[PDB]
């Protein structure tokens, strides 16, 4: 879809393995916010949404938190506290047909900037001048949408760039989708390196009598350490204590 009306798709109940994605294409831009790309495997994600659009080569930099531009103001804005990864690659092969392709649009004029994760599909005439045009195009009023016009002979700055933006939250809810690491056995009442739904640490876990709400997976009594976790395979609740304790 065009950048003025970006498509948002919910990804859930699968395995977020990007190891298959090297052979499909090479991403020109792959930079993550609030999460590291190297640590993208050993984590589990609560809610994942994919935002997809098509922009140019001189426009990929505007898809970032705390960045200005005509797309950042009028087409697609990212929040300041954004936790996600932006995936972008050149697509001059498929999207850019011969004679130009004019199926991708961008909103050139708007009254003001956009709040983050907000789309505007209204096609009403922008009243640039003081006089109201009232539904006709002419002087001092323009159609807000403009055509990209991708042509294979353009430079890299005008080549098509397919962008998929993944928005996800870390460790606040049950995790439906995460990576390729294989689950192992559970060793209770022992000091062991544990990884529960992407939460890694060192300690000894015991059985707990706590009760968890269905929207709660991670608990804190004192908000500096996670007291208890719900195991992803078996629904029993196991409270985690530090490995070395007693104060000798």
């Amino acid at each position, epitope marked *: 879809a065009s950048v003025y009306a970006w498509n948002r798709k919910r990804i859930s109940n699968c395995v977020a393995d990007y190891s298959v994605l090297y052979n499909s294409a090479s991403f020109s831009t792959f930079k993550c916010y609030g999460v590291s790309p190297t640590k993208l495997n050993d984590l589990c994600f609560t809610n994942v949404y994919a935002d997809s659009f098509v922009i140019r080569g001189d426009e990929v930099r505007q898809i970032a938190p705390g960045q200005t531009g005509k797309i950042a103001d009028y087409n697609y804005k990212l929040p300041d506290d954004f936790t996600g990864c932006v995936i972008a690659w050149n697509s001059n092969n498929l999207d850019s047909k011969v*004679g130009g392709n*004019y199926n991708y649009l961008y909103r050139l004029f708007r009254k003001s900037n956009l709040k983050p994760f907000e789309r505007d599909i209204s096609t009403e005439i922008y009243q640039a001048g003081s006089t109201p045009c009232n539904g006709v*195009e002419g002087f001092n009023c323009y159609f807000p949408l*403009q*055509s990209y016009g991708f042509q294979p002979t353009n430079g890299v700055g005008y080549q098509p760039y397919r962008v998929v933006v993944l928005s996800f939250e870390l460790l606040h809810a049950p995790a439906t989708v995460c990576g390729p690491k294989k689950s192992t056995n559970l060793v209770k009442n022992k000091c062991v390196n544990f990884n529960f739904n992407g939460l890694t640490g060192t300690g000894v876990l015991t059985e707990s009598n706590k009760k968890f709400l269905p929207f709660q997976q991670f608990g804190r009594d004192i908000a500096d350490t996670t007291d208890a976790v719900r195991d992803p395979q078996t629904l029993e609740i196991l409270d985690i204590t530090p490995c070395s304790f007693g104060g000798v």
Partner: antibody
Amino acid sequence: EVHLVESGGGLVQPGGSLRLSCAASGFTFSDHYMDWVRQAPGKGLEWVGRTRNKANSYTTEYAASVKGRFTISRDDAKNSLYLQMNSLKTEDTAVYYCARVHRWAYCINGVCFGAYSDYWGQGTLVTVS
Amino acid sequence: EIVLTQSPGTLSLSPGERATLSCRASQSVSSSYLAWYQQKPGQAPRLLIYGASSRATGIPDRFSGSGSGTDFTLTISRLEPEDFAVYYCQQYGSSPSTFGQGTKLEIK
């Protein structure tokens, strides 16, 4: 490559009725938008009408001087393009070209982005007197 | 409606040298959506330039057009005897599309 072959021309009295057809081959005739452009003998080209595909459900737009007097239609099954001739005046004598708009043009609301003509047919000289 | 005025109306040049062609619009067309056509007398016009600067398929680098806003220029170089035609400008950014009156180019 692309072949727009036309039919239905002839000499007609003013105020009569007549039917035109353009046959097409060698390309996806369903996908492309289409135009009618007329050329009066010794005068410049003049646009007549434009038609859409299934995505806009055969939406038709006309020129100001031909609104209400002409009817354009198309059927992609037998690849036949039609225009209906009605209420003829002496200004309607011309050669009629049915031309092919680029496939990758897009039309949003009213404005059209990239809709240029790409291929043209030979046309017939219709005469009204 | 956008009125296109082509000037000058009559061109008659020998093969080899430089000739210029102009189409002037009554109002500023949207995003340089102008076309360029040639019509040899026995056959319909053919696409040359789309977007007023880009060449069509099968069209060599000889066929050169330029311009923005309201002033545009089509420039033909190295004319060959087969180049005789009438040249038209068509606007297509703003509906309805409108053609100019045309410039007649003759090869000596």
